């Protein structure tokens, strides 16, 4: 049998078992059975490899749901949205009055107004948790029909109950086309959701069910044999979306009124990225509903496997330690302070004098400036020897006799200007003024007369003279010896019986010596504060006035300071033009015209005259004067007679110069003069002049002007843009975007040329390569030549890793590639402002640069050979969108906004509300998103706690708290993670192919040394869409492509279905399986989390991902990784342009490299055939 040593061994083994029992009794009442826990974990693993990966569902709690509703401002309708009420009776806060959920909608929905749920706890034994529940679900239909459901559960303290309620909305019919969009070359359709004149589109249903489970922990611990958990799904309501009604469920209108603390409520939703018409078949609709339900039930069952495993024995877990908020905050604060110091450095420029480049031209123009008066002077002491002259215009027909018998008189008429004629003024001439600058010319005037004889002008019909009576004198008595005694009376018109009082006096002429002297011109600048420097420009000046002129040549320009009386001091550049004007040489061609009458009207002198009688008995002399004449007109009137040899009718009018010029007229326009060079008249001449034709011409100085100039004009700087960045940024991304916006100014405009941009990029690449301390580039060229040639090389993965590491380390090259891409794309600045708070990541741009350059140098062709066509180039080249970063950016900006960004002068704010994605928040990425999703589905990831009760604790309370802790700590890991990489193609006038690459991995095993059919594995697919249609609201409509056009056969579809839905489609044809796979991936990731980067997708990184999707590696993820998220995070690093992970085998990245180089080479060969 067994010896005595064996008996000692047996006794010590039994003693050790008793020590274990002691320890277990010391710790608590929970079981600690290692072997049962291990079998439980292996069985839960075997189950978990069957939880579907598809469809894509996005779980939100109450908080993120309200944030998302605040974000999204367009129509927000989800194909399936499941509101899950979940709770563990150990975590419910039993102190509450009621355990409730009540959430309602504020609009009309075909099936739904409110949903109310109340949990009642009939029995609860807290020593060994034995719960008896009663859930009562109450739903109210829109017509106020109240429907009741009941559910009763008996079980344990730590087991979960889920009540799921789905509101289905299927888009079954779009109506149209109702025209054609012109900005997007697509037909226009309409989507009728509300009570309108049209036929409804959306068909609405519902689906209500309860999930509960029994973890057989107690009888496992009793019988000491394992027993798989049992999960039971109870159906309660399923209304298929058959008929089409108005007013579907919009998720901006759902209000979540009340939820008792301790209850877990999530919203699980799949919203289409673009609107897509569903399938009207009954079986298809019901599969679409049941796939959602199956994924939710699968996640629930996985969580319950975790809870059973933790209840059976001790499982230790490490919570994923969080990122450092405080260290990143310190780093960003230091960067901000560096920006502030750069601003402080730039602020010194406000103490210096800064200039700008100035350039313009002024054309041949006509301009007019008039003097104070026309050039006129009067010789003094001018006496007239004719019968009719300046003063007296009297008939001999009228009755006027003197002491001679019928003897007419002999008049003398004298003109006497009072004062000196000298005038010396220098003018401030105004030629041109403008918003930006204003030119003023200058000169001076010189006047003094030369001595020459007077000039008389003859009127054939002279006007109303100042000497014009009605009656002059009467005869009273005659003498035999003495002679006829006269009684002179000098009344003049106008008299008491008249209208339009008048008067005028003839003005003699002589010629003076005019000297109009120019020495300078001056242009003022509005914003110039001091002397401009580097003055340049060329001028020629030519005059015309009178009959003579000056032509002057001035070329040198110099800065100058002066002041004007209207705006103050002015700064600019002046021209030395020195000359002198003298027209006495030949002024004599205006002799023909020139009779000038001076307007003098008053009513004061009406009927007044001199009274005296002189003759026989009275002496021959009188001496007195009437001086109202002097008051009214600044001179004297003379009338005096003598007896002697001959008589003179002395009539003398005396005038002042200034009053004379106060009313001067230029009548006799009968023979009118013309410009010295026959130029059009400048609106101070012959422009409805109405007798005013010569005073201006002898007043206005009209000249010819053309010329141009250049200089550097000082200016005050304001706030420099670095001070602006320091004063109003919020973030380091805004500092980066402001730096990009500023550097778009320093770059040349030679780059808006395709050839020059390619040359610049080649120079940047040569700089990048020449600076490398290692020779990885030559071996990368060797690998690319092997691949192009068709041989297989094992270390292409290491070649790729070296290239990606180098690009990640050379950030200057990446920044300059990004800057040139931003400069040369259509509307770079609009794009940078569209980015908002995010950055475009420049890694993928430089990565594509390096790839294309290596293949081109391998085949030895320049890149301008493949880039030939007409603009926009990507519509006329089958490869330009693939190898050029600028064309790819242009295509993506055209696709994203449906060409609304090519609208003129559109601003980013107006443009950002024009995205073509369904349910586009204002917080979403302009470019198609690229991220990893890792979140639990159907329940939260933290429990809702309680505060410690302030009474005295009870042992059953302690036990209940321990059970809650054990059921919740470490059991809420997500069952999978996934990544999406979407890429767009432009195929014809208004058609695109959107190729969306899904890739996800299930939860990693607790036991990884098993065979591959029991371990976590990956599953991916590439589903292609086609964008032909658009709505009257500016959003696209997708038509989904079959499995053939995606590159899959029947067997490939079989394998993909098994990989993605966890099971064999039993009774599904390949058409139905592909419908499932395609319709499961189009959903969208809805979240409140913000990204801070923008990534540009490429065809060839798409081929790299397709390599993992089509030929997956033979890899044991559970032994290599620690988290299913790490794998998709590594693949996401690779997709974003970084290097492959070192956890992978060599051949994985080898095959990725070769696939991308092969794809690019085949494209370039097919393009070469042209």
From TrEMBL:
<feature type="coiled-coil region">
    <location>
        <begin position="737"/>
        <end position="764"/>
    </location>
</feature>
<protein>
    <recommendedName>
        <fullName>PPPDE domain-containing protein</fullName>
    </recommendedName>
</protein>
<dbReference type="InterPro" id="IPR008580">
    <property type="entry name" value="PPPDE_dom"/>
</dbReference>
<keyword id="KW-0175">Coiled coil</keyword>
<dbReference type="GO" id="GO:0008233">
    <property type="term" value="F:peptidase activity"/>
</dbReference>
<feature type="domain" description="PPPDE">
    <location>
        <begin position="938"/>
        <end position="1153"/>
    </location>
</feature>
């Amino acid at each position: 049998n067994i010896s005595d040593n064996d008996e000692n061994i047996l006794k010590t083994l039994i003693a050790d078992y008793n020590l274990r029992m002691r320890r277990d009794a010391l710790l608590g009442e929970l079981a600690r059975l290692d072997e049962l826990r291990d079998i439980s974990q292996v069985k839960g693993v075997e189950y978990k490899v069957t939880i579907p990966l598809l469809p894509v569902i996005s779980t939100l709690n109450q908080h993120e749901f309200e944030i998302t509703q605040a974000n999204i401002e367009t129509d927000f309708i989800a194909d399936n949205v499941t509101f899950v009420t979940s709770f563990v009776p150990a975590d419910l806060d039993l102190e509450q009055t009621i355990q409730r959920v009540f959430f309602r909608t504020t609009a009309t929905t075909p099936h739904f107004q409110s949903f109310n749920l109340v949990i009642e706890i009939l029995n609860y034994d807290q020593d060994s948790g034995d719960v008896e529940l009663h859930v009562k679900i109450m739903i109210v239909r829109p017509n106020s029909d109240v429907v009741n459901y009941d559910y009763t559960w008996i079980g344990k303290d730590y087991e979960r109950i889920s009540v799921c309620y789905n509101l289905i909305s299927h888009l079954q019919r779009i109506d149209g086309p109702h025209g054609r969009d012109d900005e997007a070359e697509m037909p226009i359709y309409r989507i009728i959701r509300r009570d309108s004149g049209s036929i409804p589109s959306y068909a609405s249903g519902e689906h209500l069910y309860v999930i509960s489970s029994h973890l057989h922990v107690d009888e496992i611990v009793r019988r000491r044999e394992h027993k798989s958990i049992s999960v039971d799904v109870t159906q309660l309501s399923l209304i298929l979306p058959i008929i089409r009604t108005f007013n579907p469920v919009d998720l901006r209108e759902v209000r979540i009124e009340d939820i008792t603390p301790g209850i877990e409520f999530t919203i699980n939703m799949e919203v289409s990225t673009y609107l897509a018409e569903s399938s009207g078949s009954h079986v298809d609709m019901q599969r679409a509903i049941m796939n959602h339900a199956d994924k939710i039930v699968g996640n629930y069952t996985g969580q319950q496997w975790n809870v059973q495993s933790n209840m059976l024995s001790e499982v230790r877990t490490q919570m994923l330690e969080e990122e450092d908020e405080e260290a990143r905050q310190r780093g960003d604060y230091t960067t901000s302070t560096l920006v502030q110091t750069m601003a402080q450095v730039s602020d010194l420029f406000s103490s210096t004098i800064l200039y700008r480049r100035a350039e313009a031209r002024l054309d041949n123009t006509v301009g007019a400036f008039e003097l104070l008066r026309p050039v006129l002077s009067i010789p003094s002491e001018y006496v007239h020897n004719g019968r009719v002259g300046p003063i007296t215009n009297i008939p001999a027909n009228a009755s006027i006799v003197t002491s001679s018998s019928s003897g007419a008189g002999q008049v003398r008429n004298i003109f006497k200007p009072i004062g000196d004629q000298t005038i010396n003024e220098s003018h401030f001439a105004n030629v041109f003024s403008n918003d930006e600058y204003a030119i003023y010319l200058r000169f001076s005037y010189r006047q003094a007369p030369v001595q020459s004889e007077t000039v008389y002008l003859q009127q054939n019909l002279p006007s109303m003279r100042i000497v014009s009576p009605s009656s002059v004198s009467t005869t009273v008595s005659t003498a035999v010896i003495g002679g006829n005694t006269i009684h002179i009376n000098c009344p003049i018109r106008p008299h008491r019986e008249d209208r339009l009082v008048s008067g005028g006096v003839q003005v003699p002429r002589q010629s003076t010596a005019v000297e109009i002297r120019v020495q300078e011109i001056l242009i003022g600048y509005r914003q110039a504060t001091t002397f401009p420097i580097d003055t340049e420009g060329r001028l020629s000046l030519e005059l015309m006035y009178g009959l003579e002129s000056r032509s002057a040549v001035g070329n040198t320009m110099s800065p100058v300071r002066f002041v004007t009386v209207n705006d103050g001091e002015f700064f600019g550049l002046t021209c030395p033009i020195d000359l002198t004007l003298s027209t006495v040489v030949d002024p004599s061609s205006y002799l023909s015209d020139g009779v000038i009458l001076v307007a003098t009207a008053f009513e004061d002198l009406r009927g007044y005259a001199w009274v005296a009688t002189l003759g026989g008995d009275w002496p021959r002399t009188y001496n007195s004067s009437m001086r109202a004449f002097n008051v009214l007109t600044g001179g004297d009137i003379n009338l005096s007679t003598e007896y002697g040899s001959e008589m003179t009718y002395t009539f003398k009018v005396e005038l002042p110069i200034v009053y004379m010029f106060n009313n001067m007229t230029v009548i006799s326009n009968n023979v009118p003069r013309v410009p010295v060079l026959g130029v059009t008249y400048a609106s101070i001449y012959q422009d409805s002049r109405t007798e005013l034709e010569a005073r201006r011409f002898l007043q206005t100085l009209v000249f010819r002007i053309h010329g141009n100039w250049s200089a550097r004009i000082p200016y005050t700087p304001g706030n420099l843009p670095t001070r602006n960045t320091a004063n109003q940024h919020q973030d380091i991304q805004q500092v980066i975007n402001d730096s990009i916006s500023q550097e778009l100014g320093r770059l040349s405009d030679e780059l808006l040329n395709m050839k020059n941009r390619l040359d610049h990029l080649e120079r940047q690449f040569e700089m990048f390569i020449q600076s490398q301390e290692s020779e990885w580039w030559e071996i990368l060229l060797n690998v690319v030549m092997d691949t192009v040639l068709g041989y297989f090389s094992t270390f292409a993965g290491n070649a790729l890793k070296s290239a990606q590491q180098a690009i990640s380390k050379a950030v200057g090259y990446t920044r300059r590639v990004l800057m040139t891409v931003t400069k040369t794309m259509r509307n770079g600045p609009i794009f940078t402002r569209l980015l908002g708070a995010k950055n475009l990541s420049g890694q993928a741009l430089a990565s594509l640069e390096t790839l294309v350059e290596s293949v081109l140098r391998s085949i030895n062709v320049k890149k301008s050979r493949f880039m030939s066509g007409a603009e926009p180039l990507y519509k006329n080249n089958k490869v330009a969108q693939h190898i050029d970063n600028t064309e790819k950016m242009n295509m993506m900006m055209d696709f994203s906004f449906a060409n609304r960004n090519n609208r003129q002068n559109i601003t980013a704010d107006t443009l950002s509300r024009m995205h073509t994605q369904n349910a586009h928040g204002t917080s979403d990425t302009v470019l198609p998103a690229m991220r990893v999703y890792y979140r639990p589905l159907g329940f939260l990831d933290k429990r809702v706690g309680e505060a410690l009760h302030k009474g005295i604790t009870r042992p059953e309370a302690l036990k209940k708290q321990l059970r809650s802790d054990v059921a919740n700590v470490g059991t809420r890991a997500p069952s999978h993670a996934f990544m999406t990489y979407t890429d767009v193609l432009y195929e014809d006038a208004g058609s695109y192919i959107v190729s969306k690459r899904y890739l996800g991995i299930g939860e990693l095993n607790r036991f990884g040394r098993t065979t591959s059919d029991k371990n976590a594995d990956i599953g991916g697919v590439n589903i292609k869409y086609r964008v032909n249609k658009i709505t009257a609201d500016g959003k696209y409509i997708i038509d989904r492509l079959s499995h053939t056009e995606s590159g899959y056969t029947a067997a490939d579809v079989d394998r993909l279905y098994r990989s993605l839905f966890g099971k064999q489609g039993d009774g599904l044809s390949t058409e139905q399986k592909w419908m499932d796979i395609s319709r499961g991936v189009d959903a969208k990731i809805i979240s409140a989390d913000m990204v801070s980067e923008e990534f540009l997708s490429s065809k060839y990184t798409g081929q790299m991902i397709d390599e993992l999707i089509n030929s997956p590696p033979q890899f044991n993820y559970s032994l290599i990784y620690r988290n299913c998220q790490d794998f998709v995070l590594d693949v996401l690093r690779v997709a974003q342009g970084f290097s492959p992970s070192n956890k992978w085998d060599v051949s994985t990245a080898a095959r990725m490299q070769q696939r991308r180089v092969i794809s690019l080479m085949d494209d370039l060969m097919s393009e070469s055939e042209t």
